[PDB]
């Protein structure tokens, strides 16, 4: 036969990078709400 | 590579340092640590 055929692989070497604005996530800016976080 | 070695040592020391400093966060009520709370109250409220 001496047949030839394709194959493939996805790998997944990397992923999305994420960051979070800690304290903003916890609270929208409500003033003393953030003050409690500093407490 | 020497810098890499140092970054290992430093990151590890830093992790421990940040852990150490959690002791002084109030996490809540006033006087983040030990006997300071007890000295004012020493009662069921203090236990809370």
From Swiss-Prot, chain B:
It comes from the Viruses. Residues 6-48 form a coiled coil. Acts as a viral fusion peptide which is unmasked following S2 cleavage occurring upon virus endocytosis. This is Spike protein S2'. It comes from Human coronavirus HKU1 (isolate N5). The lineage of its organism: Viruses, Riboviria, Orthornavirae, Pisuviricota, Pisoniviricetes. The gene is S. The chain holds residues 1025 to 1072 of 1351 of the full protein.
